[PDB]
Design a protein around this ligand. Structure first.
Ligand SMILES: Cc1cn([C@H]2C[C@H](O)[C@@H](COP(=O)(O)OP(=O)(O)O)O2)c(=O)[nH]c1=O
Ligand SMILES: Cc1cn([C@H]2C[C@H](O)[C@@H](COP(=O)(O)OP(=O)(O)O)O2)c(=O)[nH]c1=O
Ligand SMILES: Cc1cn([C@H]2C[C@H](O)[C@@H](COP(=O)(O)OP(=O)(O)O)O2)c(=O)[nH]c1=O
Ligand SMILES: Cc1cn([C@H]2C[C@H](O)[C@@H](COP(=O)(O)OP(=O)(O)O)O2)c(=O)[nH]c1=O
Ligand SMILES: C[N+](C)(C)C
Ligand SMILES: C[N+](C)(C)C
Lengths: 132, 132, 133, 133
């Protein structure tokens, strides 16, 4: 019982393709203040390796695949994201890395707040002191 | 001088790839209430063919290409979206269609409000009466 | 009539996706000796700008779109490739460019012979001289 | 030692992107008679589940990732393909599956011979009987 959740999204499917709509405090359990997206990824060059005190996130794999590795201080879960109709809710005080990006994989992140470099914990031991 | 704008985004480029961050009332000229994204597109099956009174939008081509065709009531502009570091701001009282989607092209839309089927103008003549 | 053909491919479609199969002297009207693919393309960085007296090619956009521009010494013909089930045969004495690549668009090329840098014409003026002998 | 090889390809990289070239009896250790590509793949809809006495293949993920599962009648070997500059040679008397496709992932296959549905083994039990003669 870690603070993440798999979100299965409802798509409007038709001849012209698929559409997924995600709204503030409905499919998204917070108000979107920011989105960012990561592209030109490579499988040998992983990303993240950080935690956040207050910031909450929803991760959608727009293109390709990756392994999200989550850690709350004790046991740690590997979640593979590889389709656009699934999102990963990442709660508070959660260490995450993203590895094994398929070449050119495109990740989309929906953020509960504006970018704040100070509130990044980029040191795993510092994270563990903060958890305990 | 129609109510659209090309947005050239700043990317943090490094070994692990590219990251673009877009924030409420900074890179985005409104507060995000909703995002939706369109995938499994086809070049022979176009989309949109509608206008909106109040709703404002930012369009980002996450994958592949398409032609956005804009119309405000008089002259009409074709804008080709084909890279993730460019967004298209679509203002108020603007008719748009999206055609010539590359097979499997992925469009991302950032919306200034919650989904409201009533405020869709899906009739071009109705749109023109409303403009004049 | 310029020496190119649009090839419409038959796909085997099920709930697991689509398969296209291309064989020597059947859907491909030559013997594949080499294939090449291009990726990490950019809308603002076009490619091609060469011609070949002998080499026949078949072009397939596996991902995204680009604009193939074909010239046999008269006017440019643009052919948009934006789906994987269409191919473009390009015959002999054909100058070609490929521009307006969607970002990260991928092109597959089935070629009729082994790579010879010597047999490349990479100058348009050289190509017109060659076509006006 | 199972009859597969990981192929590392040399790419020509410039500011216009990357090109990989694959030739008969050079980077590909057979003569290409046919190529096929698969697209509109789904993580939950795996493909393959067949073997071939004669047909040699080279697999390349041009877009996205999948898990190739290889079996010559002993234990499964998983090989992840997730970049376009790696290929997977699959020799004779090899059962293969391809699963955990990223959504819309695209696979290119260079094949040593023309398509023969007759020469396909699409039953695993049939494959073990064949490998235990
Ligand atoms: C998330 C984010 C990052 N950045 C900057 C911080 C770094 O200099 C750079 C890369 O971010 P970084 O934290 O290293 O990325 P990841 O989570 O993929 O490991 O981008 C912003 O400017 N704004 C943002 O909203
Ligand atoms: C934009 C949007 C559409 N939809 C529905 C409306 C339609 O039934 C379906 C397709 O939308 P539609 O307006 O036809 O799409 P497009 O702008 O690409 O032409 O999705 C939602 O449920 N929520 C949304 O936020
Ligand atoms: C087509 C091809 C190119 N190359 C090399 C030649 C160049 O140095 C490099 C780029 O090829 P180039 O002709 O510049 O590519 P394009 O037709 O896409 O513009 O790749 C090979 O080594 N083998 C081949 O079969
Ligand atoms: C490989 C191949 C398949 N096909 C047909 C056979 C089947 O009806 C269909 C799907 O092939 P199948 O063997 O089911 O594909 P996979 O190996 O990806 O599981 O395509 C051809 O017609 N030619 C070919 O060269
Ligand atoms: C607790 N969780 C299983 C929903 C992540
Ligand atoms: C008016 N506009 C040129 C900025 C669209």
């Amino acid at each position: 019982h870690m603070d993440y959740k798999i979100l299965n999204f409802d798509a409007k499917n038709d001849n012209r393709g698929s559409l997924i709509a995600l709204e503030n405090l409905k499919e998204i359990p917070f108000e979107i203040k920011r989105i960012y997206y990561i592209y030109d990824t490579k499988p040998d060059f992983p990303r993240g390796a950080h935690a956040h005190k207050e910031l909450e996130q929803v991760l959608i794999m727009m293109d390709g695949s990756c392994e999200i590795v989550l850690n709350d201080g004790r046991n740690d879960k590997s979640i593979i994201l590889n389709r656009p109709n699934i999102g990963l809710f990442i709660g508070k005080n959660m260490w995450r890395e993203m590895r094994n990006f398929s070449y050119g994989a495109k990740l989309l992140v929906l953020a509960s707040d504006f970018y704040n470099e100070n509130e990044y914990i980029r040191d795993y031991d510092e994270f563990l002191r903060m958890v305990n």
